Design an enzyme around this catalytic site. Sequence first.
Site, PDB file in Angstrom:
ATOM      1  N   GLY A 224      -8.053  -1.612   0.201  1.00 28.42           N
ATOM      2  CA  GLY A 224      -7.057  -0.998   0.752  1.00 28.42           C
ATOM      3  C   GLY A 224      -5.610  -2.583   0.130  1.00 28.42           C
TER       4      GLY A 224
ATOM      5  CD  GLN B 294      -8.135  -9.834   0.553  1.00 29.32           C
ATOM      6  OE1 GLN B 294      -7.283  -9.923   1.507  1.00 29.32           O
ATOM      7  NE2 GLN B 294      -9.453  -9.846   0.109  1.00 29.32           N
ATOM      8  CB  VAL B 295      -9.569  -3.936   6.922  1.00 30.94           C
ATOM      9  CG1 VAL B 295      -9.936  -3.476   8.324  1.00 30.94           C
ATOM     10  CG2 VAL B 295      -8.178  -3.565   6.808  1.00 30.94           C
TER      11      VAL B 295
ATOM     12  CG  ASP C  36       1.704   4.148   5.136  1.00 26.87           C
ATOM     13  OD1 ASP C  36       1.616   5.210   4.414  1.00 26.87           O
ATOM     14  OD2 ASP C  36       0.430   3.653   5.060  1.00 26.87           O
TER      15      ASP C  36
END
Lengths: 304, 277
Positions: free
Chosen positions: B24, B28-29, B134
């Site tokens: 993404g 970072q996830v 969003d």
Amino acid sequence: ELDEQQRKRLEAFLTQKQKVGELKDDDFEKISELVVFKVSHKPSGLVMARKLIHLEIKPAIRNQIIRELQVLHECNSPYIVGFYGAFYSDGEISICMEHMDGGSLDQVLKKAGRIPEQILGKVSIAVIKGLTYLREKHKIMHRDVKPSNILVNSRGEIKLCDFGVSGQLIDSMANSFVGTRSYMSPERLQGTHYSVQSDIWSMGLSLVEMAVGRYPIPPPDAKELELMFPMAIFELLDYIVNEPPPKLPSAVFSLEFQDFVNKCLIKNPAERADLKQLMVHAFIKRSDAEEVDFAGWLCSTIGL
Amino acid sequence: TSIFLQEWDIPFEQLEIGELIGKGRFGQVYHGRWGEVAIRLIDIERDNEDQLKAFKREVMAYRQTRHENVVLFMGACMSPPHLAIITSLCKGRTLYSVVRDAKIVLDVNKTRQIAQEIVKGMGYLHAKGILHKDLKSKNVFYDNGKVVITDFGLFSISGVLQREDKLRIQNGWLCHLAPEIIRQLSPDTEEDKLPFSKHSDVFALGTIWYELHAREWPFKTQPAEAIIWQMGTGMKPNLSQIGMGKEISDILLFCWAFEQEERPTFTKLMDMLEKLP
Ligand SMILES: CNS(=O)(=O)Nc1cccc(-n2c(=O)n(C3CC3)c(=O)c3c(Nc4ccc(I)cc4F)n(C)c(=O)c(C)c32)c1
Ligand SMILES: Nc1ncnc2c1ncn2[C@@H]1O[C@H](COP(=O)(O)OP(=O)(O)NP(=O)(O)O)[C@@H](O)[C@H]1O
Ligand SMILES: Nc1ncnc2c1ncn2[C@@H]1O[C@H](COP(=O)(O)OP(=O)(O)NP(=O)(O)O)[C@@H](O)[C@H]1O
Ligand SMILES: [Mg+2]
Ligand SMILES: [Mg+2]
């Protein structure tokens, strides 16, 4: 639509492309940055240009991408940059093509002040015949003609590049860049049916930009046209759609050239000149039967 | 100048970081363990005190939220230049993936129900004065009828727009942007100063409603510049080409209304959605 010297050069390029066979990452050594890089094939002494499009999707779609891209091996023209092969490497698809030592007309115009009318005539002939070639022998329209995708060399050929052969590659690209210069036709901006007339509009707009030395929308006031010789994307697009098209200054350019661009920049694509009308236009009949040393002007201006 | 993890009402002893969950554009996830958790690591400039205090303002806002249709904000630890936001981990798949799964049936009742869940979540967030900015199907999670909204508010601090004199536009983004916003995008545009509002959130939910019924984004065929111009002048698709009734199209007519003041609140929208067949 045939010459000898061009036949010879195309034969030579065929011979050359025979050399490469297959491609993969380590064959190539980065020479310089042009994303596109000037690179050196080692299995064969060629200097190529390699453009790397970053795509991140499953293998079946990238295989469809390369199958669709293989069509460029078949298209061959003195007005088309040469294609060599397309492979996938490490989350990026590579397109390797003929390297053009003069670059795009974007940067040559950037270094020169403005491009003189007769050279623009020559490039107009090149672009119109290239588009006619694509439409007649492959039933494809370019879909993205602009100065940065017209390439020039010290040997004096001018060819089109980065044209629309693969619908799936259009789908697969994750994100696009929109700046302050648009070359999209009014009918494409409005989402109506379009043809190569849109490419003709884009060519007209590129030609006027190169002739004046400034992107022509919004038109400059008297002060900046005098000295030559903060805008939101949406209102530029709305200007293109609803205001009258740009036009060359009447003093410093021929009637034939002014009328040529005016015929390219007609908003209604049905009334806009088509490829063959432009093929018989006065301006390119005049420019066709002229002797300009394009290579000489090029090399002298770019220092090459 | 500092945000510690003991400042939160969730008791915290240890935090484990696992594999990356997905790619993404904003940080970072990663997978994490606390139960299982989602950890978003973000990078900032060593001494941009301005945006750091803006960020703390925002996450202090987030500490007050709790709602079944809103991802559980569990904690945020800052320590510059690298900051992290830790939320609950969503079981299931994004609505984006579900919508594009041919084996999944999406009848009109189920789409109405998903929409109502998203609307409840959004109205909760609005009632607390929090704008999403969003809303989109990649930021909604669906697990066998449980619907959760994620990533609200991040866009202000996101930097997902960051070439020279060229604005980077991701596919799917523009068709969620209300006309007032579309008409202001520039290569100088900055996430923190775009005119987001509750009306733009309702617009984005309208885009989600379209996507729920057509099972694809609107303006799928068209390039970005065409989309900008068409949306800025107010041209919008409908769902009659696929046989959707008048009522399912009126949701779009209302949520996508050109003038903001004509768009309904999420309460009114919830009502409108209840009255479908
Ligand atoms: C904005 N209008 S749009 O939304 O409709 N998208 C769209 C429209 C028109 C063209 C492209 N386009 C493209 O811009 N580039 C350049 C990356 C910047 C392509 O390279 C490109 C492409 N590669 C390619 C092919 C032959 C050679 I010789 C050299 C090349 F680099 N091929 C195969 C395409 O088929 C299309 C369709 C391309 C995108
Ligand atoms: N075969 C080539 N020979 C010489 N220069 C090239 C070649 N291919 C690309 N370039 C240059 O590489 C640079 C990047 O071009 P490109 O990736 O097409 O993006 P762009 O020119 O900035 N805008 P656009 O052309 O619309 O994508 C430009 O300066 C081109 O002139
Ligand atoms: N709570 C969560 N549970 C499960 N997956 C999550 C969670 N939060 C984020 N993800 C995943 O993490 C990945 C990155 O998400 P994110 O950074 O928000 O970008 P994105 O919204 O998915 N795409 P983009 O809008 O272009 O940045 C995606 O695959 C998400 O599905
Ligand atoms: Mg290019
Ligand atoms: Mg997300």
